[PDB]
Amino acid sequence: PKPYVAINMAELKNEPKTFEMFASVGPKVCMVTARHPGFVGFQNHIQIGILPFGNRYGGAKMDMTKESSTVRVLQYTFWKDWKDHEEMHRQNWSYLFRLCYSCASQMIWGPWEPIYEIIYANMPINTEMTDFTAVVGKKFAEGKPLDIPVISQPYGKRVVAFAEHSVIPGKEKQFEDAIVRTLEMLKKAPGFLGAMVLKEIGVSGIGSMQFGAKGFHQVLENPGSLEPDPNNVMYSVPEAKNTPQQYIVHVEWANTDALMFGMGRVLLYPELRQVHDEVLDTLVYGPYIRILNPMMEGTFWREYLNE
Amino acid sequence: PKPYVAINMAELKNEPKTFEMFASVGPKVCMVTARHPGFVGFQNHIQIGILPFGNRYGGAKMDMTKESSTVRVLQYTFWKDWKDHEEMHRQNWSYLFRLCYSCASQMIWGPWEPIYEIIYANMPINTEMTDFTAVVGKKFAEGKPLDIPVISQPYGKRVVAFAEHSVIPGKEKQFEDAIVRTLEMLKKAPGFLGAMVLKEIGVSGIGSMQFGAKGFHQVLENPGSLEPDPNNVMYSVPEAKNTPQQYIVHVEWANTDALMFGMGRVLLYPELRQVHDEVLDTLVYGPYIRILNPMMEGTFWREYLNE
Amino acid sequence: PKPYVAINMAELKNEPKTFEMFASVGPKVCMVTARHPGFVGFQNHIQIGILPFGNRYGGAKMDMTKESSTVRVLQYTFWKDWKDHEEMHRQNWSYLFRLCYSCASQMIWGPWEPIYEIIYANMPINTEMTDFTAVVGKKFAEGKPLDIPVISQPYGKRVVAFAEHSVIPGKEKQFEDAIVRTLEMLKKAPGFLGAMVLKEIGVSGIGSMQFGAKGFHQVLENPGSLEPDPNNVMYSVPEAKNTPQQYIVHVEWANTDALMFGMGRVLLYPELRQVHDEVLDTLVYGPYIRILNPMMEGTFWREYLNE
Amino acid sequence: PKPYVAINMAELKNEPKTFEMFASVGPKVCMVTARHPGFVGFQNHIQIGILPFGNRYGGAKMDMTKESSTVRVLQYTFWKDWKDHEEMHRQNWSYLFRLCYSCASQMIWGPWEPIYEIIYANMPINTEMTDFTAVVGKKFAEGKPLDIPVISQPYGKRVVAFAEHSVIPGKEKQFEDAIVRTLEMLKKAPGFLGAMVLKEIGVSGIGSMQFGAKGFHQVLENPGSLEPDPNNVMYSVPEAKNTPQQYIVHVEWANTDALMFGMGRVLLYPELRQVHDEVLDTLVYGPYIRILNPMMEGTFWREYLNE
Ligand SMILES: [Fe+3]
Ligand SMILES: [Fe+3]
Ligand SMILES: [Fe+3]
Ligand SMILES: [Fe+3]
C-alpha cells in the first residue's frame, strides 16, 4: 500500500567535511529510524542543480555541484502511518537528537520536515543492471510479462525531478485530476523511471527542531549530549499544514538529458501540453524543479508500495 | 502515418557562446513551434564530421569537432501537413523571428530550410537502456515479439549518416526503387538503428529569412525586436523545389564505427553492391555523407510515424 | 567576345600542406588545360571571408583566414565554347585526373564544377601599377582616352565579391534586367574594378568526379595512377542545370573596405536602392556574398573578353 | 556453408603514419576485393599482444601496444572457393598491387598469405549491444530460442585468441578429433564468443608478393605505379602447403580477462585438461597464442557461414 512520507530538508556548507558526516552519521540516523516497525524505508537525496526552463532561471543549470557553496539535502523516510514517524522520534530522541546535532557545524538552514501523503504513485522496485535477467525470468514464469519494470538503478545511478507546486485554494481537485492525467501520459517519455505526487499534510515540529521557548533554549545552549524536552513541541503535525496547499511532483529519470527533454514533453508535445495547462492554471507557486541525486536509500520502501 | 519534414540548416562559429545559445534559445524556439497542433516533434542535429570514403575526402574525418572552426546545425521539425509549418511560422512570427534573430551574432551561413516528404521510413521509437525490459515485456504480453525494436537511445547517444543525393531528371523512379531495395538490405548491418528517405518538395522562404526587398531591408536593419513583414515572402514552398531532384538518405547507427562499416556494406558486400550500383547510376550529385549527432529531440515524432 | 566559365569548387583543410599543393599541383593543372585551343585563361580564387551584412552573419567577417579550419577554392576557367571544356577534360584525362586526385588528402568537399554563360560583363584588362604610364600613352596616341581602364592589379592585389543568387521561376528576365541596371550604376563607386553576371547553364559531371557506379568505384578504389572511365558520366552539362536558376554576380574591388561600402551602395544610396530592390524581389536564395582573393590567374582571358 | 580463409600477414612500424594508412588505404583494398562475387567478407586484426602462459613468455603480455616498436596485422578474407581469391588478385592486380605497395614505407616483414580451409566452426553473427532486443524478439517469434547467440560485438569491441599449432606428420586425425572435443567443452567458459579451426591448405604466392626472378625485380624496382607480372608466380596454392601440417585455433572472447581464464580452462579444469592433453601430444610447435583485436571487418561473412 501507499506509505506516508517525511521529507527532512536542510542546507549545509558544500565542503568535504559535510560529505564525511553524511557517510559517518547518516547511516547511524537511518539505523536508529529503523528501530520502529512502521518504518518501511528511505530515499535520501542531495540537490545537484535546478532545471533552468530555457533561461527562465538562466543562472541555474542541472548540475551546479562544482560551483555551489551549499548543498541541500532532502531525506525521504516512508511510514505505514505518519504517526509512526512521530512516535519513532520520541522513542529514540536521545540517539536521534545527538546524532542530528553533530551536523550543527555544517548547517546553514533547517532541518525542516514536512509530512506528505502519497495521492498518486507509479513507482517500480529498484534493480541493478545485474538483476534484470532474473526479474524477467520470474515475471514470465508467473505469466505476468506486463509486470516487468524498467531498470531503475539504485544508489546514485539515476536522477530525480523534484517539482514544487502550491495550489490556489479551491483548485486542489482540479490540480490533482490534471496532474494524474499528466503523469499517465508522461510515462511514455524515454528514460522515465516512475512518478508520484506528494500532498503535504503537515509539518513535524520535533523533526524540525521547532520547540516552544524551553526547547528552543535547550537547543541553542546544548553541548551536544543533552536532549531538548520533546514534550515542548507546541503543535501537532496537521496544525502546521500549509494553505495554499503544497504538493511535490516527484519524477525519476535515467539521466539528466532524459529528465530535461522528458519533463519538457509537457511543453513540447501539443496533446500533453493541453492537459498540463490545466495544472498550470491552478498554481499559486511553481513549477520549481530541483534536480536530485538519490544517493543513499533503503529500496525496500518500493516493495512495500507495490504489495 | 508519415509526417513532413522541415530541415532548418545553418552554419555558426564553433565556440562556447554558440553552444550556450543552443541551450538557452533552442528550447524556447521548440516551445513556440509546439503551439501548433500539427507539430508532431523534432530532431535537432549538429554535424560532427564527414564520411571520408577511404581518402576520397582525405581531409575529412568522422569527428572533426575538435579542429573545426564552425558548427553546422540541421534541425528537423516534423509536421502532419507541411502547410502547418508555414502557418506556425506566420501565426507565431513575433516570437520566432526575435528568438531566431538572437543567433545572428554567431551565424556564418543560413538559415536555409528545405521541406521534405518521406517516401520511405523504417524508424523505431527511441528507448533508453533502462526501458528495454518493459518494452520486451509489453510486446510479449501483446503477442508481438517481432515488434521489439532495436535500442535507439535518444539525446546524443547514437549517430546519423546524412547522405545527400541529387538525381538526373527522368531517373527519379529508378533512384527511389533502388534506394528502397538498398535500405531493406542494409538493415542487416550490425548497429543499424533505422533509415528513411526524404524527398525535397520545396523551400520555406520564411524559415530561410528569404524575403522580397522590403523584408530583406527589415532583416538587415533590425534592432532585434521588430518583425520583418512575413507576407513579403515572394515564393511559395513548391516554387523553390530543386531540379535536379534532391533527396536525403537518413540512416541511424549505434556508433561511428557501426556507421562507417555499415554504410560500407553497400560497397563491401557483393550482393548489396550490385543493388546499390543502380542508385549510383542515377546521380547528378553525391553521395555526400555528413555525420550528425542528434542532440536535442522530441522523440514522440516516432510515435506519430509508427501509429 | 564573351567566353563561357567553368567554376571548379572545393573545400580543403586550412593548413600549410594544402597551400603547398596549390603551388605545386595548381600550375600543372592549368598547363594541361592550356593544351586545348579553346582555353582562353583562368582566374583562381581562395575565399578569404564572408560579407556580414552588418550583423546578419554576425559570426562572419571579410577576412576569416586566421581562424578558419578550412579553405574554399573557386577556380574559373574560361572557354570559347563550353563544349571545349568538356572536350579538354576527356582528351587529357590521364594527366588531369591524376593531378586533381593528388589533392584528395586535403579534400573535405568537392570538386563541384558548374558551367556558366556570361550575360553581362564590364571587366577591364589587368595592369600592374608599373604599366599605367604606357597604357595611358598608348590610348592617347590612338585617340581613345575612354579606353583607359582603372588599375585592376593581378595576382592577389585586389578582392572579389562573389554574390550568389537563385531566382524564382518566371522572374529570370526581371532579375537579369534589374541586375544589369544595378551594376551600371554601381560602377560609380570608388574602387570599383569591374563586374560580370554569370548564369548557370549546367554542371560538368567529369569535372565534379560524378560518374555512374563504375567510375564511382574506380574513384574510391583509386591508388592515384589509374583513370576512372571518362565515358561513365551519366548526364550531359545542360541536364544538370538547376531550377531555381542560379546566378553569380561577380564584382571586383580595390580592397575590402571599397568592397564593403561599394557593395553597400545598393543599400545606402536611395536612387540605387530602388533599382536593386527589383533584384531582391526575384530571389529564392541570396544574396550571399563570399569575399575572394584572386591569387593565380591567366589575365589574358580579359583580352579575349574585350576583343 | 564454410568459406575458405586467406590470412594476409605483415609486420609494420608501430607509429601513427602506419595507422593512418590503415584507415585510408585499408578500405580501398577491401572495396577492390569485393569486386569478386566469391568474396563473402573479411575480418582484419592487429595483434595487441601475446598470451604469456604464466611466465613461459614472461617478457610478453596480453597488451603490448604501448611498448612495442612494431604492429602485426592479420587480415582474414573469406571466399566461397579459395580459387576465387587467386582469381580476384589477378583480375584486379593493377589496383591491388598499387594499393598494397603504398604500404611499403612502413613494412618490416611480409606480406605472407597462407590459405586455409575451415574444418570446425562455432561462430555467431556479430551484433551490437543495441541489436539484441530485436534478435531475441525475432528468435522467439520463429520459435527458436536456442538459436539466440551470445552478443559478439563488431569493430574492435572483443578480442581474439589466435593459437598457432603445427602437428606431427601422421597425427593430424588425432589433433583434429581432440581439438573439436576441446572446443565443444570450451564453449562453457564465461565470455566465450565462438571458435573455429583453420587448416592450412597452401600459400598464395601472388598475395605474398613471391614471384619468380622477373616479378621480384619488378617489385624491387617499382616506382609504385607499375605492376609486376601476376602470372610470374611459380607455384600453385597447394604446392606451398606446409608439412608439418599447420593449424590455427581461433577463439573469440568478451575481453582479455575472459580470454586468459577462458583459454586457461584447458589447464585448470581437470575434465577438460584430460581432453586437451590429447591435442598437446600431437604437436611439433605450439600452442603459441597471439592476442588480436578485430578492428575492421565485414561481418556478413558470418551470415554466409551460418546459412
Ligand atoms: Fe525524521
Ligand atoms: Fe522552421
Ligand atoms: Fe575543370
Ligand atoms: Fe589477399
Description:
Chains A, B, C, D: This is Sulfur oxygenase/reductase. Chains A, B, C, D: InterPro entries: Dimeric_a/b-barrel, S_Oase_red. Chains A, B, C, D: It comes from Acidianus ambivalens (Desulfurolobus ambivalens). Chains A, B, C, D: Catalyzes the simultaneous oxidation and reduction of elemental sulfur in the presence of oxygen, with sulfite and hydrogen sulfide as products. This is part of a larger assembly, with 4 copies of chain A (307 residues). Helices cover 32% and strands 30% of the residues of chain A. With 307 residues, chain A is α+β, with helices and mostly antiparallel strands. An 8-stranded antiparallel beta barrel of chain A has the order 1-3-2-9-6-8-7-5, surrounded by 4 helices. Chains in contact: A-B, B-C, B-D, C-D.
